[model samples]
Target: IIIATKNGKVRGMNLTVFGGTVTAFLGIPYAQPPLGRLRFKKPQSLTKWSDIWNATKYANSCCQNIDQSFPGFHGSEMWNPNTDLSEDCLYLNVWIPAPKPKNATVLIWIYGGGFQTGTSSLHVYDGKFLARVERVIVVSMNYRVGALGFLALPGNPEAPGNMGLFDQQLALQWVQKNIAAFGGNPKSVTLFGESAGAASVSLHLLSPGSHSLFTRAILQSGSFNAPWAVTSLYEARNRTLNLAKLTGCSRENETEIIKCLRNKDPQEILLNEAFVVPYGTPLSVNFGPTVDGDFLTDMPDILLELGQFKKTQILVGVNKDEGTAFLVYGAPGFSKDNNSIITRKEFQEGLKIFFPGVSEFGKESILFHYTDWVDDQRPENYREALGDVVGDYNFICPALEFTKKFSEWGNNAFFYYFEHRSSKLPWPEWMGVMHGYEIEFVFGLPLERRDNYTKAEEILSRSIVKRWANFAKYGNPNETQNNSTSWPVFKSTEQKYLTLNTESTRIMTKLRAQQCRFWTSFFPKV
Candidate 1:
């Protein structure tokens, strides 16, 4: 298929998926390359090209570490192997089913990697399945990550933070200008993501520049209120200076430090040992979006409390065991050995990592509520208890808080809890529905690489795909076909949410109401 975009004519390839064909336009540049002078600055608009651009292949991913091992513990095997790292990575991809209808709803996806890693070329993120099954255009874009993307320096345009977010804004602008040619409705765009990507979508909701870029949003397992999502401006600046000093750049003069670091090799900057996080510090997001006066005026929770965000249809939720993945990988001390009970020392240290500056009484208050003394003697029990705390502190509670505020602001909000797990998960039985376990189901992809599926898993996948597609099309997931089970709009009075389990999908009210109330006493309005 050939389409003439505002920039130039582009030819796409037809790929078969789910027994149907979809046109895929890959590696289309939306902005000028962010290299040399463009580094650390907002993305610049691209100029029109005279010749047809061959967008038939995936572009190089923005520079960062890419693990090549297959089926490793860190889930690297699920990503696309065609990725090549480079600084000139400001590209986007589009997928549309053949015989495209006019004004078709568009779903724009953003990949997540803790604001330090990730790419749009991952095989798991391939848009063909969703496009063919859901009958919607799928779009995904690449943005900068790590220190290169989010280093803030005082009084320096060369080092203002949130450059990665600006890149996303530019891509949205590009879509508004060119999606019509690809048979997409710019006004019906739905922004959706998981983990850090979900947090990014939340931030965009509060951004003034992104007001009309999207009409709906779906956040999975993360939000701006998540403890690791944002770094204070003071901490961000200190981290930048320390990074420069470690890299042999003179930190005495701010101007010299910025220029010197820019001239250094991108790999040297990325591979620096200081960028690595030590184990057991599971809640630290060293490099990520920070508060800037322009893009992000204040703390995200504060902004949401003031109702300073776009009032759009929203679907947000978390998995049953959202923290198990991070705990297993980062907190090896919590291993399920017979002798591995969480000691008082370990619990205190873990609490300090997340709730720094809190008094001893405050830490004790948290432990008193989350502790399970009856089963605490067992190793697996300790692990489960800590994992639940981590999940609630970082993901579940924050998402519920956001939903309440968003619903109270008079927007259509739908909340859910994902309790089903695919048989393909490689984790132990104790890890139930770990973070990011729902990506494949949402996109109508198979549970594993072999495309194997149980009857229940297949039904669940179809249900999720249909619901998400309907939400993108009509601003509500239940507008199409109806059954006895229907999603209800979230309201503070009712405080309801849908429970997504394989046995039966149904609505439930007052999710974790008691736990959320306890958290609010310490971290008010979050």
Candidate 2:
């Protein structure tokens, strides 16, 4: 099958294997791969080509360390087989339910890899199953990753940091102009992702460039309140210096350093600057988005607090045991005694060291109020603290604060907490429902990995998907047929939210009311 986008013609595959008509368009370039002088520059529209481009195979994965675990939990089998990864890897894939029905809401997927690794081609990202059952148009996109995507350089006025986010904005522009030819509604689009991807969507909600690009958003197991969530050139300089030292370039000689890095092999750069344990002040080189004033005008937390954002509906929440995934998979060798992990008290100490006079305790109290006391009282207290601190810093508190701010901006916002465990899993009885487990339910996919899916789980998955798709279509999640009660709108007054669990689905009082107040007070005015 071939479809003509505004840029050019794209060839795709129409699969009948998944039952309903499933069509996929892969490797469609959204921007002229940012290579050569284009490197480190804001993305430009791709040149239009007259010939039909093959969209069968996915482009190369962005430059990153493939050795690290993804989803921090739901392990994926994607390998970086290409040794020729270039800056020209800004491509996108589309999966539309075949037979092209009218009024299909579009869902744009942003993959997660702590904002550094990941592509649109991972097996776990296969949208055929979702399209077959949900009947919505889906898309997965590839942007620059690692230093190439988010490196915040010194003395560079062109593109400072968060190039990856700029790449996503360009892709959304392409989709708005072209997705309709493939039976997708540009006006009705929902941006969704897990982890960093979820965090990115949250960033977009705060960015002026992304205004009016999406109507609704779905953030699973991710949020936007931490300093590292989106950084500034000041913080990025540390990682940039780390990269410079590794490549033997002195920060003292700025021009020569940029030239030397530009001339170095992309893989060598990525490998040399591979991983940085995200602790106190010395964050990793690939430590997510940077607040480069332009793309990310103001800090996400500040913007959310000031009520400056797109007027759109949002669904954001976190898993019960998000930290267990980080411990069991990603950072296996991470010291249990590491102050940042053991207790919020230690984490707060580190935060103060990194940012002098900054009151991180206020934020910590809101997220992990019982972290320090949990240590011996409960064997899983540290783990709970880990989940609370990490989840709240990266996901929960940000969602709550952002929801409150957005409501003040006259936008509709809904909050949730997915605490239900998979009935089929052998239940790490203590681990509870860890991160990435929501994927099996969110996509309504058959669980081939292990004991993770049950009939009840499938129903819940379908229910959530219906709710999400409905939100994309109608700008309100409450329009779904399965909803028995009108979902209460989140506001500053009644800090209530929906709890998605097995026992029952209903609205509940604010789970961390006092903590939210503390965060709001700490960040007095946005």
Candidate 3:
């Protein structure tokens, strides 16, 4: 396939998947490279070009030292960006079925890496399977990551926050202007993501700047209301300056600080962001989005209360054990061995990591609430206890609250609980449907990577991909398959959700109502 975008002409090849072909267009530049002076600034659209850009290879990941993020973990190895890293990375990829369907539905993907690292170039994120099977166009864009992407100084216009987010917004605009040429309906765009990406989906949903860029959204295992999702402007300022100090930059003036830091090697700045805070602490986000007066008017919580978000249909969900993926780095023993138990000290340390900025009362109340004094007061029970708190406090409750608020405000919303555990997961069995394990099934990995999955899983994956496609096309998951499970609309009172599991596929309700209720005592309005 070949087409001319606003900036240039490009060509792409077709790949045979199973019995069909899917058109593959890789690494189409959406913006000029953020080099030298452009570093730490909002993305600039590429100037018009006469020559066709080479369009086969994947984009290099934005600058970040992945070696410092996760080392020996199985998930880490699986998502490793085989493509090299570069400061010049500002690209998007697209895949459409060879025999394109009319008004082809589009799904734009945003990846998650703690807002620290991620790329659209990973093999796991290849859009071939979904494009072929669903007859939908799949698009994923590469944005800046780590300190290079998010090191914003609040008052300084030179390095305003959300540069990475602006990069995504630019990709959406590119899709609007260029996607139709690739045979996709700009009106049928469904923006979806996991973790920080999910949070990005929410931010985009809320941002006036991103209002018309999408028609709907899917948020899996991440929430804008999560305690760690948005950093305060003051906190962001402190971290940025601390990053400057860590790099031995002249902090004499904010302008001088940015000038000196901009001149420093990008990798040097990225590696020093690690020293900004204790790793994984809620207050320790070395770089993240702030409430920039223009792009993001307020926190997502405040935005929802005011009904400021775009009223698009939303599909939101969480994994059965959403937090275990996070626990892998710190509580390795908790999942590694059956005998290992959580200690009070370990519990407090984890509390700080996940719930920093909570006051003494909130901390004490949470500790007292999660313990099982009524039955097994043993530390082993706290093992089960801590895991629940970690998952519920950070991932589950925030999802429920956001869904509830969005639906109550009269916007369309669908909720689901990702309950199927892949037989091929490399983590301990106890981890149980942890955070990102659903990415494979969502991408139809079970069908393609048969040796790594089972027949039961393939069936489930089929249902999920179809459901996703149907939702993207018709604004409802059961639009094409009436005999299959019906996805109930989520409202504040009804709270119904589809349970997505191989054996337990059914409509269910009240996802952790009792546990999520306890969270309100800490932040009633949250």
Candidate 4:
């Protein structure tokens, strides 16, 4: 199928046989390259073209120099390398269902890679399955990552930080202007993502520029309160300065800095070894999403408190064991005794850094109780703690707490906990809904890479896909599904959430009461 995009006509193939009802258009650019004079500035619309642009391949990733094989994370090889790496990577793709309509709702997907690494071309992001099965227009895109996308340079007046977010905003503008050509309704768009991608969407909810870009949002396993969330502009700048020095761009002369950096090869920037913007740092030291006054007015929690966010329908939740993935993969701190006993003293030391001012005795008591509950089980107490911290502060707390404030704005918000784990080889029966498990379910994708899915997994995936599709069509996920599960709206009194499990979905009350209280009490209003 060929459609006339804003720039020109482009061709895409239809995948209805795979359960998609829409024609898919891949690799569309929304803005001009943010390099040279455009670096760090708000994304500008792409120049009009008179020729048919090929929408066959994904665009290059933003200028990144991190090692692809860095321990504990998936490498770039998992995604298509056809696009390579570059600064000119502000592009989006679309999956339009078969029937052209004036009001078919749209779902824009954002890929997560700790903000420094990731591409929209990841298999989990392939919209063909979702479009065919769920019957909704799906859009996904690649934005700048690491230094090129979000470096905070002090002397640069035109752009400072958060260029990645501006890139996303520009893509939304493209959807608003050109999605109708592919039978998508611009009025009904939902922004969704997992992990860093999910956190990015959360950031957009807080950014003034992102208001009105989408009518709804779905965050899975990520949120603004993650210790990995970035805040200080100066800190970002310092990291950029280190990169500049390593790359010979720190010439001390301000103009020379920009000139020399721009003139350098884009490939050289991607291959730089000193680019240490890996994920899993504390919220204060995370590499992505700097607090630039323009795109982001303040922290997400604070903005939501003051009701400064867009009044849109929101669906947000975390996996039951978000931290298990990090720990099992031996990510950072998890290296120390992956399954060894975690003493109260050891837990206290770690908690001190994350939750300061907690009396040592209080920390010890909490750790003691947590350790006793899990008791040298297959999934160990430390692993559970890690998952709880990753799931709670990074996502669950922000999600629940955000919903608490969002309900005050007179909007509808639904929350769920994904608890179904894949039963594939090397998979622990006790993995218990670790992070990223929802991707297969959300897309209804077959467990092709792993063992065949049991009947229960299939049913669960079908239910989730139906719920997600219904949410995209209307604002409610449970609008028209056979599951008949009553997914509850997060409320102040009930504090309930829908727990998605293998057998069936159930309502779990008081989902994370103490953690929610901690976030609300500690964070200030925007």
Candidate 4, lDDT over the whole model: 0.69
What is the TM-score of candidate 2?
Answer: 0.83
All models: lDDT? Answer: 0.81, 0.68, 0.82, 0.69
Estimate TM-scores for all models. Answer: 0.92, 0.83, 0.94, 0.86
lDDT of 3 by residue, 238-285 (tens): 788788888888577788888888799887987788877654452234
Best by lDDT: 3
lDDT of 1 at 329: 41
Residue 276 miss distance in model 3 (angstroms):
1.6
Q: Is candidate 1 or candidate 2 better by lDDT?
A: 1
Weakest lDDT window of 10 consecutive positions for candidate 4: 277-286
Per-residue error (Å), model 4, residue 303: 2.1
Model 3 earns a TM-score of: 0.94
lDDT of 1 at 152: 81
Task: Give candidate 2 regions above 4 Å deviation.
Answer: 68-86, 154-159, 251-253, 274-285, 328-382, 423-429, 447-452, 482-485, 514-526
Candidate 1 RMSD computed on C-alpha atoms after optimal superposition onto the true structure: 2.9
**Candidate maximizing TM-score:** 3
Please list all clashing residue pairs in model 3, or write none if there are none: none
**Candidate 1 — worst ten consecutive residues by lDDT sum?**
273-282
Q: Can you write out model 2's per-residue Cα lDDT over 1-526, one digit (the tens) per residue?
A: 8887877998899776444568888788888877766666678887778888998888766667665343342233333323245566888888888787676888998877777677777665777766766788888888777778877763366547788888999889988888888888888889988877887888888888888677789887665654446655665777777777887766576666676777777776787665323343322325568767777786666677677777777877767656454443333223323422345354444434333444555545443454447246654455455445544544566667666666776677777778877775432545568666776567666433343566666667667777777776776667356445556777878877777766677778786765455445654432
